[PDB]
Amino acid sequence: ICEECGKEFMDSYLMNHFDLPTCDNCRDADDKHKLITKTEAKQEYLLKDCDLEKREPPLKFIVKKNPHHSQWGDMKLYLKLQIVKRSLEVWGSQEALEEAKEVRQENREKMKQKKFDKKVKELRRAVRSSVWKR
């Protein structure tokens, strides 16, 4: 049972890892999807942990070896069409996503400059307190 080509098949690379009825003949390696890791689904499409495992339907992942560790731990992989379908479900339209990213991408450079004034107001407080008194 499929939906893209409608063929009857027992199992494929999909529908046992992501629950998607898609045959393994074409498989669309760079056509319909890619394999996006977990850390790219948090900083690009801006989803918290309450979006990948609590919003119905909860989507699952694939564990694999870490590329630059080889003895340490995991590397989770998600299906790319399942992420951008979830980002449209959590954040209204697609033209609300990047517009929310502009006010977020300025908050780190706001932290970059507000770190540099508390470093001024504290180091100048140590020398102004010695001259104000008498």
Binding site members: 2, 5, 23, 26
Cα–Cα dist 26/13, whole Å: 11
Identify the residue among 67, 126, 130, 134 touching DNA (CB under 7 A). Answer: 67
x/- string (CB under 7 A) for DNA, residues 25-64? ---------xx-xxx------x-x---------------x
CA atoms lying within 13 Å on the CB side of residue 125: 6
Q: Which residue is nearest to Zn ion (CB)?
A: 4
Chosen residue from 73, 95, 116, 133 binding DNA by CB under 7 A: 73
Residue of 14, 52, 77, 83 that binds DNA (CB under 7 A)? 77
Cis peptide before 21 (omega within 30 of 0): no
What contacts 8, CB < 8 A, 6 or more positions away?
1, 2
Give the CA count within 13 Å in the CB-facing half-sphere of 104. Answer: 11
Annotated binding site for Zn(2+): 2, 5, 23, 26
CB 44 within 8 A of CB 34: no
The site partner of 4 among Zn ion, DNA, none (C-beta below 5 to 8 Å per kind) is Zn ion
What does the binding site for DNA look like in residue numbers (CB under 7 A)? 34-35, 37-39, 46, 48, 64, 66-69, 71-77, 104, 107-108, 111, 114
